[PDB]
Design a binder for this molecule. Structure first.
Ligand SMILES: O=C(NCc1ccccc1)c1cc(-c2n[nH]cc2-c2cccc(Cl)c2)c[nH]1
Length: 333
């Protein structure tokens, strides 16, 4: 038999024998670090039990499965291997995802007293990976530090492909039911960029009501041109709020937060504040796009013309049992 079981914490990992001494380490599953004798590199193994028994979850697990193979990019996590220990459909149960092992996730990095070199370089890689996703037709809409993992050389990778509860990093046009274009992901990048700076969540709403309130509390009531763009019932809910003028970005992110040591740092701080003011905009029409973000003086020292400019590479609802077989078929390559 080609598998063997190890227990790690609450979980028992039954994997191919190629993966050795599993040890503990998100996401929508349970995860172990492991050694891969076949490739001779450490890997992460995520376990997905009965992924088909939650409709929403099944669709997303199927998607993350076919896309994660469809996509290839240095800043997206790619599927090294997928397998199931069960040998028949009737008994099919667990899916195991193997990815390359990283050294931390972004929430852990965010906590460091980070400088602009590291900070902009991570953001470069985020925008860079976002841009790619976009050129494939994937618009994420659900980016958050927890689904981002980085190595100790600061190389970065987005772990998932988002939408078709943490609401903190969701764009306004998402939580409000408006259409969206590419830069709907720019919002998220900015809630993160601003979070490396305060070290705290920008818009930590207790719920979806208090979400919007943490937002227009700091940025101010959107202009009528924006409100005109809401559905009649959504307006009234969003209108009726307390009207705010918002705060200037030197106020939302005072010099206190950045390492304004000397000229370089001072300049780099204001640039960061400038980018933040272009990314953290409520109206998608006034919000910066991914490219100009990459070309921003806070970011562009990282711009590698080839690494970016380069060769550019559904949806139904199912019964649980049709998900199970659909997901099963996929794992059977
Ligand atoms: O903290 C980490 N590694 C350090 C570590 C801890 C214990 C043992 C070895 C290494 C770490 C790795 C990862 C990771 N690397 N590749 C994939 C992942 C990953 C973890 C959880 C969920 C997904 Cl979808 C992917 C996330 N955090």
């Amino acid at each position: 038999n080609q598998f063997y079981s190890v227990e790690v914490g609450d979980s028992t990992f039954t994997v191919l024998k190629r993966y050795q001494n599993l040890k503990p380490i998100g996401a929508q599953g349970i995860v172990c670090a492991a050694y891969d004798a076949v490739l001779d590199r450490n890997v992460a193994i995520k376990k997905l039990s009965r992924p088909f028994q939650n409709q929403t979850h099944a669709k997303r697990a199927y998607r993350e499965l076919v896309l994660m193979k469809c996509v290839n990019h240095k800043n997206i996590i790619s599927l090294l291997n997928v397998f199931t220990p069960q040998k028949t459909l009737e008994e099919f149960q667990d899916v195991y995802l193997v990815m390359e092992l990283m050294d931390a996730n972004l929430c852990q990095v965010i906590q460091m007293e980070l400088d602009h070199e590291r900070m902009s370089y991570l953001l470069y890689q985020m925008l860079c990976g976002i841009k790619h996703l976009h050129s494939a037709g994937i618009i994420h809409r659900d980016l958050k530090p927890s689904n981002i993992v980085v190595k100790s050389d600061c190389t970065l990778k987005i772990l998932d492909f988002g939408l078709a509860v943490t609401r903190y990093y969701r764009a306004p046009e998402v939580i409000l039911g408006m259409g969206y274009k590419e830069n709907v992901d720019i919002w998220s990048v900015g809630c993160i960029m601003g979070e490396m700076v305060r070290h705290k969540i920008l818009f930590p709403g207790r719920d979806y009501i208090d979400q919007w309130n943490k937002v227009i509390e700091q940025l101010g009531t959107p202009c009528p041109e924006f409100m005109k763009k809401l559905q009649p019932t959504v307006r009234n809910y969003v209108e009726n709020r307390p009207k705010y003028a918002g705060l200037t970005f030197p106020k939302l992110f005072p010099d206190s937060l950045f390492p304004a040591d000397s000229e370089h740092n001072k300049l780099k701080a204001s640039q960061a504040r400038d980018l933040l003011s272009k990314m953290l905009v409520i109206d998608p029409a006034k919000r910066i796009s991914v490219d100009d973000a990459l070309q921003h003086p806070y970011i562009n020292v990282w711009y590698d013309p080839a690494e970016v400019e380069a060769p550019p590479p559904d949806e139904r609802e199912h019964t649980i049992e049709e998900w199970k077989e659909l997901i099963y078929k996929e794992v059977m390559n």
